[PDB]
A paper describes a structure:
The family of heme-containing peroxidase enzymes is widespread in biology. They catalyse the H2O2-dependent oxidation of a range of different substrates, and in doing so underpin a number of essential biological processes in bacterial, yeast, plant, fungal and mammalian systems. The key to their catalytic power is the formation of two transient, oxidized heme intermediates. [name] (APX) catalyses the H2O2-dependent oxidation of ascorbate using the Compound I and Compound II intermediates.
Reaction of ferric APX with m-chloroperbenzoic acid (m-[name]) initially yields a Compound I intermediate (λmax=409, 527, 575sh, 649 nm); this decays rapidly to a Compound II intermediate (λmax=415, 528, 558 nm), which is stable over long (500 s) timescales. Having characterized the reactivity in solution (as above), we then produced Compound II in crystallo and examined the crystals using single crystal microspectrophotometry and X-ray fluorescence. Single crystal microspectrophotometry at 100 K on crystals of ferric APX reacted with m-[name] showed absorption peaks for Compound II in the visible region (λmax=530, 560 nm) that agree with those in solution. The data indicate a high-percentage conversion in the crystal, and show that the predominant species is Compound II; we cannot rule out the presence of minor amounts of unreacted ferric enzyme (which are likely to be ferric hydroxide at this temperature). To confirm the oxidation state of the iron in the crystal, Fe K-edge X-ray fluorescence spectra were collected on a single crystal of Compound II. This showed a shift of the edge to higher energy compared with crystals of the ferric enzyme, consistent with an increase in the iron oxidation state (from III to IV). Putting aside for one moment the caveats that bond lengths in X-ray experiments are not determined precisely at this resolution, nor indeed that they report directly on protonation state, the salient point is that the Fe–O bond length measured here for Compound II is longer than that of Compound I of CcP determined by reliable X-ray determinations (that is, where photoreduction has been minimized).
Author numbering: 2 to 250
Write the structure that this text describes.
């Protein structure tokens, strides 16, 4: 149910140019996972009943960066500031969601469709909307479904973003990568989740909760068996996530 706003031809030119520059910058800096987390934490605060939070540029504000769920994201913000300054016409909201999309692409992931026009909003959402890694399926549904309005399929597919990157004991407290190849976007997150724990690889309780839920589990299996199906449903879910509250909810 989206109606995307009209942006000027100069705005579109800058999107295109910024997308190319983000590719090169993110690849060189090795920060795709962090950029994906930044985009996801920007968007994931959306509350459908109040139309508050969501991907509207507010993650740049010191007050939002201070949320405990956002430890380490000040690094991402600082890393993007010089590049953003080359594209003064773009909203931060658009810029961060573009950086998220590019992060997925440059690590070998699906091409997530991108539409411009998010406006930067003045007020961050209240803290505490982002998911708790120590919790389980009910919690995931409260956050992704009751607040964000995404589906059970979306929950599982988006969890697969853990296919890139790592936790850090100085940020969340958890430590290490989910996969043996943490700068490669693939279905390995689901193959590891299924195989049991392997030395040196991380599983949050929230990841584990996918295995014992009756709706999540068949999706895990599908994605572990079929990376193409993972990529389709991942791209669908990331697009929806990046558009929460934008161009209609
Ligand atoms: C499902 C609930 C989720 C929970 C509870 C969760 C929790 C976490 C935690 C605790 C970390 C570690 C942060 C650190 O210590 O550095 C992390 C990292 C990450 N998360 Fe999530 N996450 C979830 C969903 C997602 C989603 C939906 C995405 C993207 C689609 C995502 C992408 C990432 C990425 C890319 C990293 C790694 C960042 C890096 O390498 O620096 N997560 N997540
Ligand atoms: K991987």
């Amino acid at each position: 149910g989206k109606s995307y706003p009209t942006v000027s031809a100069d705005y579109q030119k800058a999107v295109e140019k910024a997308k190319k520059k983000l590719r090169g910058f993110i690849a060189e800096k090795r920060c795709a996972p962090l950029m994906l987390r930044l985009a996801w934490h920007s968007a994931g605060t959306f509350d459908k009943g109040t139309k508050t939070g969501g991907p509207f540029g507010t993650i740049k504000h010191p007050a939002e960066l201070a949320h405990s769920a956002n430890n380490g994201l000040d690094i991402a913000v600082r890393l993007l500031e010089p590049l953003k300054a080359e594209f003064p016409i773009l909203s931060y909201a658009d810029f961060y969601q573009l950086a998220g999309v590019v992060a997925v692409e440059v690590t070998g992931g699906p091409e997530v469709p991108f539409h411009p026009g998010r406006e930067d909003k003045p007020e961050p959402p209240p803290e505490g909307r982002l998911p708790d890694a120590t919790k389980g399926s009910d919690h995931l549904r409260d956050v992704f479904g009751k607040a964000m309005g995404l589906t059970d399929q979306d929950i599982v597919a988006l969890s697969g973003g853990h296919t890139i990157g790592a936790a850090h004991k100085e940020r969340s407290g958890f430590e290490g990568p989910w996969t043996s190849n943490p700068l490669i976007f693939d279905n390995s997150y689901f193959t590891e989740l299924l195989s049991g724990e392997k030395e040196g690889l991380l599983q949050l309780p929230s990841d584990k909760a996918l295995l014992s839920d009756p709706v999540f589990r068949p999706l895990v299996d599908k994605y572990a068996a079929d990376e193409d199906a993972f990529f389709a449903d991942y791209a669908e879910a990331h697009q929806k996530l990046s558009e929460l509250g934008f161009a209609d909810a």
